[PDB]
Design a protein around this ligand. Structure first.
Ligand SMILES: [Zn+2]
Ligand SMILES: [Zn+2]
Lengths: 154, 154
């Protein structure tokens, strides 16, 4: 079906960005790339949450997109949420030049992320290896700095 | 698959609102309801545009969602874009209490509007009866006051 998507991230603070998604083959991986600025230096959790609902800001996006009812993990784990895209790294200038390729999310079918919410988080995702209950749900990535609904792009 | 959706309308000016979508059966009508504030009194074109792309504001959402390559019409016409939901009416307090039911838009399938952009326009939609070229494309509804990507709702 859809081969290109885009997401404009906004929030209450200075974090903002544009993230592109491209899936040339419906059964192949999704490329994810773009730039997020306004971030503190270092790692930031980068997740697709379940709902494309911004009525109460990023909170109403709900939890991680998890159609298979699994535990939070890193993108390379078998045990992961579909929305578990791991971390993005912001440099010393506050810019995260995102470049991710993922073969679990899709722009079509049951794992489709169109119309859900991409969220960039306050802290690093511990990829489910943090030893607490929060690690297996959110990776301890903390609060939602910016988000946007993932839309169909030209 | 998706039976509920939601859209948060924002723009450069004061227009803002929340629109809900609900489709109990995939072969059935979509109920569209909610509230838009900050509008001048009277009719405002109300359309699903093709792209869920807000990278340059509402302009990047593209033209009306039109997979059947038809001319613009009102919602009751057989010749209409899928995205042609006609007008909403703002009262003297600037509020449009939207309440629409449409069987051409869907929350699934070919006519799925999830991941596309809802736009509320500056002027009335002439429902394709204006007799100029613009009427058959946009209904002469004028500029885009506010928009949002339509996202999956809980
Ligand atoms: Zn997760
Ligand atoms: Zn139209």
């Amino acid at each position: 079906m859809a081969t290109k998507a885009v997401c404009v991230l906004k929030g209450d603070g200075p974090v903002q960005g544009i993230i592109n998604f491209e899936q040339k083959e419906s059964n192949g991986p999704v490329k994810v790339w773009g730039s997020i600025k306004g971030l503190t230096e270092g790692l930031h959790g980068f997740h697709v949450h379940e709902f494309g609902d911004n009525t109460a800001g990023c909170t109403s996006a709900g939890p991680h997109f998890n159609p298979l009812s699994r535990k939070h993990g890193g993108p390379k784990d078998e045990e992961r949420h579909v929305g578990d895209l791991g971390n993005v790294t912001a440099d010393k200038d506050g810019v995260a030049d995102v470049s991710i390729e993922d073969s679990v999310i899709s722009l079509s079918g049951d794992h489709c992320i169109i119309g859900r919410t991409l969220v960039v988080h306050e802290k690093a995702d511990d990829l489910g290896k943090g030893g607490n209950e929060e690690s297996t749900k959110t990776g301890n990535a903390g609060s939602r700095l910016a988000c946007g609904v993932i839309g169909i792009a030209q």
